[PDB]
Ligand binder design. Structure first.
Ligand code: SAH
Length: 229
């Protein structure tokens, strides 16, 4: 409960993009996902995959290239345009009618749609249900107090059977206030334990030189696989 009162605003996240402060972005993609990708998609085709707080995650293309439909939500229009530019994809726009002033960016390929609004606006849209969710730099970027609402929101997006892939970071919360925030095993059990079977697939050192700016000297990444209980 040390970071419990941290409250970031959407304007602050949008400013990080405008100012180029996006060190969370991994150009080569998540290595743990890469390792387990073939197993998670074994025997499946044409899945609908959701990427909350997607930024310009290259992993979205990995799924689209394998025949799966991808939907993401990101508050920064700049981040979304950077995704299309870097993946060399053309796109067109459409209004999100239920949330005046916002838009959804759709690739010409028809395989990727990026909603440019808040994840908390989604329940009021017709985004529908998903077979799979890839959550990295998402549950851990959400204001601590908003996590229960975030979890409830995610559940309303899931189909009967699903695979919720979740990445969280393990570090001493008294040394760095976040983001990304500290989401311990207990918090995952509190937020998802009633509805999901929880499996911790991997735990690996993720400390990089850039992390010294956080004031920590230790950093571990854990990959969880949550499925219908
Ligand atoms: N409430 C909210 N709704 C939608 N997007 C949000 C949001 N709060 C933060 N974001 C966006 O959340 C992202 C978190 S960092 C994103 C990283 C991306 N998932 C990756 O793995 O590289 C930022 O791009 C930020 O602009």
């Amino acid at each position: 409960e040390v970071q419990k009162n941290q409250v970031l605003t959407l304007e602050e996240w949008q400013d990080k993009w405008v100012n180029g402060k996006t060190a969370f972005h991994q150009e080569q993609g998540h290595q743990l996902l890469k390792k387990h990708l073939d197993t998670f998609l074994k025997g499946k085709s044409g899945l609908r995959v959701f990427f909350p707080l997607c930024g310009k995650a290259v992993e979205m293309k990995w799924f689209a290239d394998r025949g799966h439909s991808v939907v993401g939500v990101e508050i920064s229009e700049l981040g979304i345009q950077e995704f299309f530019t870097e993946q060399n994809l053309s796109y067109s726009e459409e209004p999100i009618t239920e949330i005046p002033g916002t838009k959804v960016f759709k690739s010409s390929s028809g395989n990727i749609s990026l909603y440019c609004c808040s994840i908390f606006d989604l329940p009021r849209t017709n985004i529908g249900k998903f077979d799979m969710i890839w959550d990295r730099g998402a549950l851990v970027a959400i204001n601590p107090g908003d996590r229960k609402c975030y979890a409830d929101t995610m559940f309303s997006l899931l189909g009967k059977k699903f695979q919720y892939l979740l990445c969280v970071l393990s570090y001493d919360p008294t040394k760095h206030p976040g983001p990304p925030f500290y989401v311990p095993h207990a918090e995952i059990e509190r937020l998802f334990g009633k509805i999901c079977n929880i499996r911790c697939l991997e735990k690996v050192d993720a400390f990089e030189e850039r992390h010294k700016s956080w004031g920590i000297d230790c950093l571990f990444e854990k990959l969880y696989l949550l499925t219908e209980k």
